Amino acid sequence: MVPISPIETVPVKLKPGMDGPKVKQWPLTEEKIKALVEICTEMEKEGKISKIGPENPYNTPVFAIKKKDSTKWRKLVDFRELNKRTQDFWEVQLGIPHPAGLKKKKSATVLDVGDAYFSVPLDEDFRKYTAFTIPSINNETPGIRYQYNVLPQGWKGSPAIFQSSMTKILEPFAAQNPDIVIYQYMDDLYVGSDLEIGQHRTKIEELRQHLLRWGLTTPDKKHQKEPPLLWMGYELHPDKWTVQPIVLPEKDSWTVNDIQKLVGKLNWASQIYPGIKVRQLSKLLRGTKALTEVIPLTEEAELELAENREILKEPVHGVYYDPSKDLIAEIQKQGQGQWTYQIYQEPFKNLKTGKYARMRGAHTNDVKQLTEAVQKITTESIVIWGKTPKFKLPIQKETWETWWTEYWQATWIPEWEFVNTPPLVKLWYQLEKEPIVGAETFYVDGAANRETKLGKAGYVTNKGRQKVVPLTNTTNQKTELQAIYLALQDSGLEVNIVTDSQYALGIIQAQPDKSESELVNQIIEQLIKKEKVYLAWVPAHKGIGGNEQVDKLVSA
Amino acid sequence: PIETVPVKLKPGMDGPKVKQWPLTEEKIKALVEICTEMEKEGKISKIGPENPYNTPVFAIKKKDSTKWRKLVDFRELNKRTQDFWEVQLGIPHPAGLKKKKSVTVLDVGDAYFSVPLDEDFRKYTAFTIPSINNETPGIRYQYNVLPQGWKGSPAIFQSSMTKILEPFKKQNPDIVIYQYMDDLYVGSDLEIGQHRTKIEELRQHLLRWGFLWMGYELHPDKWTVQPIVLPEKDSWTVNDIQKLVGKLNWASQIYPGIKVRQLSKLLRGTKALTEVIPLTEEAELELAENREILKEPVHGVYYDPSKDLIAEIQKQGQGQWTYQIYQEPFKNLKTGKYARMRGAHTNDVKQLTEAVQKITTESIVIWGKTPKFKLPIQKETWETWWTEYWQATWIPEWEFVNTPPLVKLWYQ
Ligand SMILES: Cc1cc(/C=C/C#N)cc(C)c1Oc1nc(NC2CCN(Cc3ccc(S(N)(=O)=O)cc3)CC2)nc2ccsc12
Ligand SMILES: [Mg+2]
């Protein structure tokens, strides 16, 4: 017999104030009882479980299940109640590596570490809470009562404790074979290396010879997989990766559940298939919950879907990461708040692709959205590769410099270069910093009645030009914008505008280039046609002329 | 020091469960090396999966030093750690620190690692060095000693610090020493000549008690509410007068007795913005009376220690930033302006981060606490970049301004 090291037990407690589970065992058929007795006798011989006396007051129900061709039963212990009562753990498995962040390895193998799982002992003081009862035949004797000595399948703490235990066992092996990489998830263990295959299979042998010091049996994974390896939705070839094939169904009747799983496929595909778009197909789900409702796909949703089918026409592939090369991210504007991007090291060999969609807002502009896309890609790149990429952006350097030097917020984007691929992001208007000599001055005002919603909007100018239009179904805020719009419509290419509307100044000083308000949009289109606009603000109701005269004109 | 001080969270709240944000590879590597040495020195230990807590960590470089330093973001733990009446029921913030000619900031965070942390509280100091690309589980640690940046550390160390310093204080009754978090602030009315010496005099005095070569020198002789200033002009356009009436109307919410009637009357009719309007005598007098009102201090401002301090910042362009500190709107307790942010002439965010640190420092000197910032920046831009330029071992709270304030005009 060879001494094996004990695996260090993790201390576990129940949530404060909570006791263990006390759930009654369901009655079972005579055949299920017989099958459960057979199974638990075997588990008991392997040290997994142990018989307890009647002193333990906790209980978790146990069931017997089957399958189609599997002519025998398996044991299911239902730990739902215990899991609700068990303390929270550090669960350290929630993300997986992105293939584009991986480095190519000459050799890679998968190990099955399923057996090692139940050689992880369970904290002694916690076992009592795992008790379960095999009901007796005809209920004429006491039930056979057992508790777990190892992490039970289904118990809340078993994934984190098993993973944490393996990590600690593996740490010496990894740290002292720096030419190896080891990755663990579920009961699978992945080893990769750049060793010729002779010495790789021996490092594998050394690894089970390391695992055996804790008495952990690890054979080669039964029925091995060969290139590509299929893993977490990907295909990993030795020198390239891609996603598992994406198939979009044809349907003449789409439901909201059909659609939201079309977006999921498209979202999945968008990490390597450049230019995927999902806004129009996401638009058909803004607000609904009974998810077999049919939706007419708009012809805008159909063109988007048909555009997606064309990009999906082919397989595409990404390459693995080379740390000795630069990391580059290029972004293109797609329209309607949509952006796409490719991350690469050599031209035409993408590491991965992606997309970004405009946040929900009343008004917005292209430069702000490009900035957000940059920040999203920055953070993703830090996750994946541990560094910020150099950016190639469809915005002229002078456009950016004008934007950030004049914009009222602080803003910044990291090292980047202009790439001349239309449509380019541009500033569509810029207001004057000073009043314009020789340009006509328009004093604008609007006003509406709360009850009737009847309003007026208009202007008076230093040349005696004047206009007031009566309006229905309006509000003060709309009349204030409508007045600015009238002044832009009726003036020459250079114009000074004086308003008392803090609301309208707040919108325009935000520099939107597109809006949810058709009226704001009309103002933007006018601004674009102008050569110079100066917008001045004055307080209302304070006797300042022009503003005084137009105020009386529009206030009934 | 063998005997730990018992510490608890506030009643009915668990420890922090804050997500670690992603880190670049060079910061991860720096943190691995620092923590390996800390773990060898007993200051931190590896923890197991039964600890579900987490506090974020990153790595910085203190102002113009080239060695990485670990910074733990204890904001959540500090909010959840019991209020501290440690050996006192309150340590008077020295109201005379803000008046001293020169104040030097000394990092003494290293002294905290001499004191064990309560064994029952250690699990709440959990933090994670993240992996790149989820390629390994993060490295999980908890503190065994008082950590830098935690609210309880100056509180629990206060008994030792006052005794370490008392021989120096006995010799120097002129010198104010104030502790906030990891830093000592040392003020004197004498010139930098003998100030540096006394600073190193104090510094080597810490060496004989079981230290850091760095400092930072402030002059709180400046710190006021800046006056509202009106233009002095020989010819006024319509536009100039409109801007003046707008500024005065804004100031009438702060100051009583501001009048714009006689100035507004100059704007009779519908005139071109660039047309020159002579000032009458009545408008001239009104302007003069307004000028007279604005040189006196604002009526009814003082600091309520029960209330948050709020700090607002405006980007003014060309490297200039204005700010105001207040508790109630229009009752500014301090206003200020910065320019030429060092090594940042093309990076707005770096400039903003330095201004935030500069304002927080003034706030600690004046009141002994940090303000809640209203930052003129979109959240995703700030959240992506601020840690890149942060150099302080404390971190204030902040919120984001998405609508441009008209008041920027009035502070420019
Ligand atoms: C994350 C990960 C996944 C797998 C999946 C297996 C399956 N199902 C395997 C390993 C080692 C993983 O973990 C890491 N993988 C890498 N690189 C990879 C290694 C594998 N190649 C693909 C490949 C190479 C050679 C052959 S071959 N010639 O033997 O048939 C077949 C396939 C892609 C890059 N780097 C790291 C760094 C830290 S962990 C880790
Ligand atoms: Mg009006």
Numbering used by the authors:
A (entry chain A): -1 to 554
B (entry chain B): 4 to 213, 227 to 428
Quoted from the paper:
There are two main types of RT inhibitors: nucleoside RT inhibitors (NRTIs), which act as chain terminators and compete with incoming nucleotides in the polymerase active site, and non-nucleoside RT inhibitors (NNRTIs), which inhibit the activity of RT noncompetitively. NNRTIs are a group of structurally diverse compounds that bind to the non-nucleoside inhibitor-binding pocket (NNIBP) located ~10 Å from the polymerase active site. NNIBP is a hydrophobic pocket that emerges only when NNRTIs bind and induce conformational rearrangements of the residues defining the pocket.
To further evaluate the resistance profile of 25a, we compared the RT inhibitory activities of 25a and RPV against two additional clinically relevant RT mutants, Y188L RT and V106A/F227L RT. While 25a and RPV exhibit similar inhibitory potency against WT RT, 25a is more resilient to Y188L and V106A/F227L mutations (0.70- and 1.7-fold change, respectively) than RPV (2.2- and 4.0-fold change, respectively). In particular, the cyanovinyl group of 25a is flipped so that it can maintain similar extent of interactions with the mutated Leu227. This torsional change, however, diverts the inhibitor away from the tunnel lined by Tyr181, Tyr183 and Tyr188 and diminishes the contact areas between 25a and all three tyrosine residues. Such movement shortens the distance between the linker amine group of 25a and the carboxyl oxygen of Lys101 from 3.05 to 2.76 Å and strengthens the hydrogen bond between them.
